[model samples]
Target chain A: KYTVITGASSGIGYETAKLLAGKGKSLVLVARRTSELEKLRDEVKQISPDSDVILKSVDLADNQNVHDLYEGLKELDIETWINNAGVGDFDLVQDIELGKIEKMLRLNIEALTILSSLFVRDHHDIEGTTLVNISSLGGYMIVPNAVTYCATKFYVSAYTEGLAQELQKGGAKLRAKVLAPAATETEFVDRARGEAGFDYSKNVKKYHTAAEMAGFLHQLIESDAIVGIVDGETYEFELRGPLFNYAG
Target chain B: KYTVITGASSGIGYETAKLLAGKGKSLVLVARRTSELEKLRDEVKQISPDSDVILKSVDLADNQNVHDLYEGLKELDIETWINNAGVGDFDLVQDIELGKIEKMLRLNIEALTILSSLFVRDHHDIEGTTLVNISSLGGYMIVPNAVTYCATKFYVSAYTEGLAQELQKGGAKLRAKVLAPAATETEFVDRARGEAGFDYSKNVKKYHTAAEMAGFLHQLIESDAIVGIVDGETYEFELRGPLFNYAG
Candidate 1:
């Protein structure tokens, strides 16, 4: 069985792939950049020569591509699926461009929902199957500059937390979880800044490296918790039950 | 000056239009159905014969149409813009069709964001201007069968709440508010039930009529509060400050 990770070309996804490869687990890596995927695959081979690595290069912002990606992966015996492809836009809502925000909405909400729904449909009956969606600390707490971006992650947080409950009520064995990481060293800042490069060491006072966040992802994978989040203040990682309110 | 209401063809939007018209306010009524919008314009004329009424019939799910709708209304002096165009899907995430969910995403998030952003950009400096986005009680609490539907409202809730703070911080005159109505007597129930007819009195224990919900919306428009919500248990309406967690 293989673990599938979207946005695996860099940062948290890339580091998580390497970490899992070191543990001798096979993986299906997905991202928009073919070269990045190839580089990651070659590195994984070096880490564990026997582990299987499959690379999928496609733009998930296109709904048709999202559906096709799942259809193409039908033959794999997948154990875990992670929806980690997301982008951030940082600015006051009035100043942000509509076209960029539209693409962000398509990628962060529509694409994630499609992949998650299809995965759960096929794997809910299979014991030990897992679905993890990568959100942000911004998912739990609203921040000033990134309101819409945080809103997208809020959907991720609430949707996955709520899905976990539904799966439990229906007696489905599939485990649904949400991992909300705080600001980390990644391409996220650059994208959020609209292509301006950023150095966390120079601008951010406290943050996690991509490798450190991968450790948290591994912890969530091995645990029975429904939420894994990094505190915005202390930057400490914790796993817990549902955080949002629920109605009958 | 005029009050703008999207999805004014029926339900809360329609009733809200009539309510505002009775108070002697000009209106810009928008909806996909031309006949319904024309009927609303005629009703507004009857309510206040001197009040100006403009009817706009456009599909908000299309991005180009959303932009055009705003551009077409550029010459009007819009006082209050209410984004009430949304849909709900009630079913297990696995059983819902992707097409329906896509339309919901575009209308609930994409269209609303575009209008809200443009309104804020143009009217932020105009004192007494208001931007209201219609969320739901589900926005605060996740419901089992409507996980994805609730997630979209979660976006509305969080986005508007955060935007309220941003507007205040920037010293902008525009007030951005979120109104979360509980179950109301509207076509929402039928739409949520996937087109099967529903009688709320027989199927639901407690709910508000669309007119009652419109009253709550009016209360929001007249208040200084950022959030207006109806309780799920007591069905009492309350307007208050921010309810979600926030970070700097």
Candidate 2:
């Protein structure tokens, strides 16, 4: 069985791919950049020669690609799928460009929702299947300048939370989890800022490295919790039952 | 000054438009159905002869129409813009048709975000401007068969909450509020159920009429609070501060 990870080109996905490969798990590494995926696959092979790695390069912003990607992956016996590909914009609601926000929504919300739904459909009845959606600290809380981006994350957080409840009641053995990371050193900041070579050290005093966040992802993979969130002030990671309020 | 209402063709928007007109406020009624908008305009004229009422026929589900609607309304001095145009799907995550969810996201998240941004841009510094995004009881708490639909409302709730804070810190006079109504009698249920004349009385024991919820909306418009939510158990309307957690 293969572990599918989107956004594996870099950041948490890339680090997580490496971490899991070292533990000798087969992986399907996906991203928009073929070169990055190729590099990661080679690195994974070097780390564990016997571990199988497949690379798929596709941009999820186009909704059609989301479905096509899913169709093509049907041949694999996928055990876990991570919806880790998302983008963000940082600005007041009025200042952010509508075009950028459109793409952000397409990737952050549309693509994630489609891929997640497809996986759950095929895997929900299976015993060891897992679906993980990457959210952010903004998912649970609101902050200035990042209001709209936070809104998308809030969708991811709530959708997964509610889905987990439904799966449990329906007696599905599959696990649905959400990982909400705060500030981490990744291309995420570059994309959110819309600039390359942006210095993260100057703006935020404390933050986690991509590799550290990968460890959190691994821990969530092994835990039975529905939520894995990073505390904004303390920057400590904790696994919890549910982050949002529930209703009958 | 005018009170702008989308989805004015039916449900809460229809009732809210009539309620505001009775108070002698000028109204801009928008909806996809021209006949219904015209009917609403005529009703407003009869209810308050001197109240100026304008009818706009546009589908918010079309993203381009959203921007055009905003640009066309540049001539009006809009005091309140209520984003009440949204749809829902009731099913398991895997069972939902992707096409419907696509339109839902477009209208629920995209159009709402654009209109809110444009309104905030022009009116944030002007006193007495109110922006209200209609959410649901599902926004705060989740229920089965409505997970994805709930996610969209969660976005509306958290987005408005954060924007309210930003407006306050920036000393802007605009008020951003979210109205989360519980089970309400409206065309919303018909669309959500994907069937005409679905009996709400048989399915759910209690629900508010559209007019009653409109009264809650009017209260929200007049209050200084940021959130107006209906209690799920008691069904009592209450106005409060922030509904979500805040991050610095």
Candidate 3:
């Protein structure tokens, strides 16, 4: 079965895409950078040449382009949709640029909403279809510099849970899962620090590796047992390292 | 002292403006409807002609227009900002128009954020300055068929609280209070039912009149309470009607 992963160029998305590719699933790597997506496609092909791979590079912030991308992917035999694309900028609301805040809202909130709606509407009748939304621990806990980011993530958390319930009520064979990780060692920190007046070098010391998070997600996908509503604290304490086998 | 009330053309805003005018407070009423605002201005004049009342009709949904409105009111000796302008559309996500969703986000989220930022920044040094945001019970409890509307209200609730905390941390005198009322007997219900598909006709009924809520707000403002998180349930049970006073 084919899996569509957005923001699959790097970090958790890339790692998850790699793991799924290794499992012999046909891959669709989606990202804004065509070159990065091509590189990912090559890596996936190296492991699973028999599996088909498609790369679609489109900016999620552009609503029309996002809609167009979904339309373009309608013919694919997609079994899984992974919404992993998000942007976060760290600045106090008063000091934050309006454009940055707007971009964040558009990408993290509006884009996610549009894409999820498109996926659910198109794939609702397909059996064994799964939609995994990557949220953040910020969805539950609020930090000073990440207020807008937290707001958008919280919206995702709420929306996903609500959507899951609605799908169940409608008897749609769509399984929705929301993964909320905290302080993952990803390009997110680097990007956050790169923003004007933000200090991330000191803050990057405390975070899980993106590879570890991707592995955890892969296990969740393969396991028949439902580990519903996994947040950051739970992932850190229960799912990682020493406590990894505690629940298993 | 001049007090500015947005959404003053009707409902709680109109009632609050009239109450403030009766108390000899100079008023600036703002809304999208010019004719309605003018009519409300004449009514306020009849009640308290001595109160310097100015009606500036403008759609707050437009961010630039909201900014311009703020610039226009820079000359007023403003002491209080009652941000009560809001719209609720209650259709399911699939049925609701995308434009309505955008409008809700713009008016309720973006406009409120912009207005709050402007007020806090400008009134930071002004003594006795306060901002009252009209949140709703939906901020806390999510009901069926009103998902988007609830999401927007939840944002307001969280944002207002965050603003208050930020001001306190910065040692600013500005105080922010969020009034989260439940079903209030206003045009909102009819509008929700007709346009937004909220069927309250057969649903579990709990409603407070707009006048009662406006009165409670006035009392809270007069008391100069630093943080008044007013909810409809609290008003219906504790303050207004006969119910258990747990505070005692």
**In DockQ terms, which candidate is top?**
1
lDDT string for model 3 (A1-248, tens) is 78989989888899888888888989888889999899988898998889899899898877777788889988888899988998887765666666666667777777777777778767776899988777776654555656667667666765665566556657777776677776776778666546443333565545667787787777656543223334443455232211001101
| TM-score of each candidate structure, all chains considered together | 0.98, 0.96, 0.84
lDDT of 3: 0.71
For residues A186-240, write the lDDT of model 1, one tens digit per residue.
9888877867678899999999999999999999989989999998879999999
- Cα lDDT tens digits, model 2, A156-185, are 999999998889888898899999999989
Model 1 agreement with the true structure over B1-248: per-residue lDDT tens digits: 99999999999999999999999999998898999999988898999999999988899999999999999999989899999989999888778788888899899999999999999889988998999999998998998899999999999999999999999999999999999999899998787776767989898998999999899999999999999998888988999998899885
Give the lDDT of residue A37 in candidate 1.
Answer: 96
Runs with alpha carbons beyond 4 Å of true place in candidate 1? none
Please give the lDDT score at residue A138 for candidate 3: 63
Kept native contacts, as fractions per model, are 0.82, 0.81, 0.03
User: Model 2's lDDT to the true fold?
Assistant: 0.91
Indicate the fraction of true inter-chain contacts that candidate 1 also forms: 0.82
TM-score of 3: 0.84
Which whole-number lDDT from 0 to 100 does residue A106 have in model 3? 73
Q: Compared with the real two-chain complex, what DockQ does model 2 have?
A: 0.76
Q: List the candidate numbers ranked by TM-score, top first.
A: 1, 2, 3
